[PDB]
Swiss-Prot record:
One of its GO terms (biological process) is antibiotic biosynthetic process. Its EC number is 3.5.3.25. It catalyses: N(omega)-hydroxy-L-arginine + H2O = hydroxyurea + L-ornithine. InterPro entries: Ureohydrolase, Ureohydrolase_dom_sf. Belongs to the arginase family. It comes from Streptomyces lavendulae. This is N(omega)-hydroxy-L-arginine amidinohydrolase. One of its GO terms (molecular function) is arginase activity.
Amino acid sequence: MIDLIVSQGRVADRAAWMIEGAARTARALEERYGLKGHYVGEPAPHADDDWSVALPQARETLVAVREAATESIKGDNLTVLVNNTCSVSLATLPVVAREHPDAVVLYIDGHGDFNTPETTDTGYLGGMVLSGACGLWDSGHGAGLRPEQAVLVGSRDIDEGERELIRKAGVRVIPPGEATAQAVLDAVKDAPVWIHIDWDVLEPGSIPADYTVPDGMLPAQIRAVFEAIPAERLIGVELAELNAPADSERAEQAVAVILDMVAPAFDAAAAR
Ligand SMILES: [Mg+2]
Ligand SMILES: [Mn+2]
């Protein structure tokens, strides 16, 4: 069984269409798998506000996601969160680390999302997510994820100062050209696995690119990861940061690619 949870409340969104992108992704999963999502939060416009303002604004949405994820994780289904922003995971990752202290988190992202209030250049909460879950700063939603159990997958061109925090904490980084299914499998060793994906990990998608070496990850590499993680070891999956307007052709094209990437893991969970 799959439990689908969908964030529709603003959590520090600086992009215009990520709440809409989450809703479109959730709808595609509902239609494909015969599910009904649990929708949490009320939409609000995007803004370039400091994390210290955006975080309290998101408190009601974050607490509601935490409670829904806690119920799902304590049962025996695959927990699937479709999130507008990576920042929703400030509420979910401490629940995962609480319930599965041996779990490895594959944080698949073009960025490291490992800034603290002291290192952030932009003040964006979404760039402070993995560091908050690991306890380098206090989000108000707990921590408890061991940095030794966090693996950044696909991250590249990381600021020297943030890359220093990452190495000091012991977070491993697997850049796109090294992010094969076997490399990711070898990183998780014998642990259960939580997958968090930020779609900016993907190579910009004019896949008319047979003669170019990609800088981002290709959809086929994401699919290969989902194919490689054994169904019995997969705790849950978070899909975040699709910036695509509702009703757009762009959203319909993006969600079809997303369905192709996640199908191996989601099909196997629906078959249990
Ligand atoms: Mg990112
Ligand atoms: Mn991110």
